[PDB]
């Protein structure tokens, strides 16, 4: 029943350059034992969570000197310096002074690096999904900086967006790029009518648009 | 070496029960405590209960009256009912273990992967692996980028593995939505061009939900 917000909600930053949370609770967090039992806590995209800092200030093994972890009662504040790909996922305060312990609705991480072009690939649907009445043409465009992209299917000339699905992926920790995958499925019938097949794309890197067509000859 | 796992039923219906147990090992529950935490979708992390190490349990307080955090110490098992099921208790389930000192646990130390619960009508559709493989007519440099679009599934998630894990080289994933009242996730894989078709890479799909799992090869065409 113990309030403790966080913000930013999200925190842009870049790799080298430092990041600061502050922790905010409705009451205080300090024990009777005066023992304050504050933690962060991490959860990398598809990952588990992790412990990082155990007692405000107290890092946890592994957990480089990069880590900070200050803080009094309502204020708390986590700060990592010397920013890498891996910082990346969302960091989580955790009071365990008083009952119910509590969360805060963590913060996203975020860092900015150098733009990085897309790499584009089609692939003509299955031979055996083919014959499973459908007809699937799924493009791939990976590894690029900023996450703002336009992707547009033509089939023969004009374009299709009709039921169109796009899927991004968060940021990765080792390069610390975003990269997504659009599919554009149909009916056999209208693959059965259809030769070629383009995926354009167009990105802030390349003025001109990224194109992985292919024909069914 | 310490271990927690979860196992779970993937979906339930709305409005009925769930009960989840924490498979442990390396320890035990009679010398340690273990929390409850869990993962509304799209959310952030909410702690759902705690049996310290004596049999006791404390409890969050919005459902402590649909929770109920048991446990067998011989059996090292943590089992965890949950009343009247709701369609925003979909989250990922956790058994995470405590690291502090007596009674006030420094921080939870060692947490499970996760078991994961979808709350809805729908029943398990099985998923549909289909290869993501080039054509003919466009080629590649250094390096090759393949994959698997596997498509079809209900409920969440499924889990890609690529030759064998002893691929790990430029591994993509992208998050499933749904279509028609199912999911459907892709899975890309990046490896260099003397190596495929040169070598016979392979897509292998888990999903406990129907537990089942397919490895698809890789050819062109």
């Known amino acids: 029943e113990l309030v403790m917000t966080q913000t930013p909600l999200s925190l842009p930053v870049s790799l080298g350059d430092q990041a600061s949370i502050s922790c905010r609770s409705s009451?205080?967090?300090?024990?009777?034992?005066?023992?304050?039992?504050l933690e962060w806590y991490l959860q990398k995209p598809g990952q588990s969570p992790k412990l990082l800092i155990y007692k405000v200030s107290n890092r946890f093994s592994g957990v480089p000197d990069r880590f900070s972890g200050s803080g009094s009662g309502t204020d708390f504040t986590l700060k990592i310096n010397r920013v890498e790909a891996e910082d990346l996922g969302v960091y989580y305060c955790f009071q365990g002074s008083h009952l119910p312990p509590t969360f805060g609705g963590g913060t996203k991480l975020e860092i900015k690096r150098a733009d990085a072009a897309p790499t584009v690939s089609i692939f003509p649907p299955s031979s055996e999904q083919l014959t499973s009445g459908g007809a699937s043409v799924v493009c791939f465009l990976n590894n690029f900086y900023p996450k703002d992209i336009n992707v547009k299917w033509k089939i023969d000339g004009s374009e299709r967006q009709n039921g169109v699905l796009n899927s991004w992926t968060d940021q990765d920790s080792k390069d610390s790029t975003y990269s997504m995958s659009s599919t554009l499925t149909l009916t056999k019938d209208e693959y059965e009518r259809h030769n070629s097949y383009t995926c354009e794309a167009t990105h802030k890197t390349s003025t001109s648009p990224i194109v992985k067509s292919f024909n069914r000859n | 070496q310490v271990q927690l796992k979860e196992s779970g039923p993937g979906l339930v219906a709305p409005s009925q029960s769930l009960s989840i147990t924490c498979t442990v090992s390396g320890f035990s529950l009679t010398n340690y405590g273990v929390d409850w935490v869990r993962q509304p979708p799209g959310k952030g992390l909410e702690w759902v209960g705690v049996?310290?190490?004596?049999?006791?349990?404390n409890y969050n307080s919005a459902l402590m009256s649909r929770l109920s955090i048991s446990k067998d110490n011989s059996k090292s098992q943590v089992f965890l009912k949950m009343n009247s099921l709701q369609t925003d208790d979909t989250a990922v389930y956790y058994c995470?273990?405590?690291?502090?000192?007596?009674?006030?646990?420094?921080?939870?130390?060692?947490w499970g992967q996760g078991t994961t619960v979808t709350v809805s009508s729908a029943k398990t559709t099985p998923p549909s692996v289909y290869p993501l493989a080039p054509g003919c007519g466009d080629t590649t440099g250094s390096s090759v980028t393949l994959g698997c679009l596997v498509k079809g599934y209900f409920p969440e998630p499924v889990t890609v593995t690529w030759n064998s894990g002893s691929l790990s080289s430029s591994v993509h994933t992208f998050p499933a939505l749904l279509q028609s009242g199912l999911y459907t996730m892709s899975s890309s894989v990046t490896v260099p061009s003397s190596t495929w078709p040169s070598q016979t890479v392979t897509c292998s799909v888990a999903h406990p939900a129907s537990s089942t799992t397919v490895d698809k090869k890789l050819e062109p065409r």
């Open positions: 995470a273990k405590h690291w502090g000192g007596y009674y006030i646990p420094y921080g939870m130390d060692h």
């Open positions: 049996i310290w190490s004596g049999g006791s349990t």
């Open positions: 009451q205080s967090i300090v024990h009777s034992n005066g023992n304050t039992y």
